Amino acid sequence: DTRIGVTIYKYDDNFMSVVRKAIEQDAKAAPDVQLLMNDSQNDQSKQNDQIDVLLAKGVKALAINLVDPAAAGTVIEKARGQNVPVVFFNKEPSRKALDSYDKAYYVGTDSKESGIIQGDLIAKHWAANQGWDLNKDGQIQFVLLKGEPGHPDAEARTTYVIKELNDKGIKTEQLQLDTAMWDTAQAKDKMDAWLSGPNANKIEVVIANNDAMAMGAVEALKAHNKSSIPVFGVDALPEALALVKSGALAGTVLNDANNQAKATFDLAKNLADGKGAADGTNWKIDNKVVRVPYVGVDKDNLAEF
Ligand SMILES: [Ca+2]
Ligand code: NA
Ligand code: NA
Ligand code: NA
């Protein structure tokens, strides 16, 4: 069987756990492929040792989710010894590293696109629901529940949901913006304070950097009999999709783990077989990179889940 070595930066990450399982499913579906999977336990030195072991097993391709993006050159130089192709995924190597090897590729998507897709989702529903503009001023008065300060996904989602709305021509007015540390209970307590204060009846849209905080806000809204106010999240978690179905959550955003897995597997298998990376597929490889769009989820495409 053709062996493909895979390193996941750490198995105790929810998103990469979904990607990992999906890649394992995709390989199971390819009878002539054997996946050699590894948990790097958030230690690049351990990942490097794991790659030395994989190369001693004759893998024909490596799919590597780096712990440290700056280690891409080290990994490429190890793979080059046996001319083994490397498909990096989810953590992006530098452009210099990708350009240094003809058989290096990347599959992943900048986190700011999750804020841009959320902003487009809110614009889509705002334009379709005039009644949400409680003061009829054409602007969205919102509150935002931020992830942990300084976390790259909290910073990007907070900055870009608002830049995207404003770039689509929708002015916004930030009535409140605080962190709830990605947590449902903290978000319920923060939203409850806002609903007990001066802005309670002026808030038109609640924006959260993830679904857990969106769900805490939905609970506070129900407690205050203010469920008329729409809430948007990010993650498309199953418990959040159940609230999209019930009408309690207006929308959320999928980070498409299945397609990151599929693109990584399809490119790695083609390269292991000595074929063009995208042969037989419709992936777009632009300067060695496949981008996998985040996707807005609401009642239009909820049946897909
Ligand atoms: Ca308004
Ligand atoms: Na996560
Ligand atoms: Na991403
Ligand atoms: Na609501």
From Swiss-Prot:
GO terms for biological process: chemotaxis; galactose transmembrane transport; methylgalactoside transport. One of its GO terms (cellular component) is membrane. GO terms for molecular function: calcium ion binding; carbohydrate binding. Keywords: Calcium, Chemotaxis, Metal-binding, Periplasm, Signal, Sugar transport, Transport. The record marks G73 as: Interacts with membrane-bound trg signal transducer. SUPFAM superfamilies: Periplasmic binding protein-like I. Gene3D superfamilies: 3.40.50.2300. Changing G73D: Improductive interaction with trg. Pfam families: Peripla_BP_4. The keyword Calcium applies. InterPro entries: Bact_Solute-Bind_Prot2, MglB-like_PBP1, Peripla_BP_I, SBP_2_dom. It is found in: Periplasm. Beta-D-galactose binds at D13, N90, H151, D153, R157, N210, D235, N255. Ca(2+) binds at D133, N135, D137, Q139, Q141, E204. Beta-D-glucose binds at D13, N90, H151, D153, R157, N210, D235, N255. Belongs to the bacterial solute-binding protein 2 family. Part of the ABC transporter complex MglABC involved in galactose/methyl galactoside import. In addition, binds D-galactose and D-glucose and plays a role in the chemotaxis towards these two sugars by interacting with the Trg chemoreceptor. Chemotaxis requires MglB, but not MglA or MglC. The ABC transporter complex is composed of one ATP-binding protein (MglA), two transmembrane proteins (MglC) and a solute-binding protein (MglB). The calcium-binding site is structurally similar to that of EF-hand proteins, but is in two parts, with the last calcium ligand provided by Glu-204. PANTHER family: D-GALACTOSE_METHYL-GALACTOSIDE BINDING PERIPLASMIC PROTEIN MGLB (PTHR30036:SF2), D-XYLOSE-BINDING PERIPLASMIC PROTEIN (PTHR30036). This is D-galactose/methyl-galactoside binding periplasmic protein MglB. It comes from Escherichia coli (strain K12).
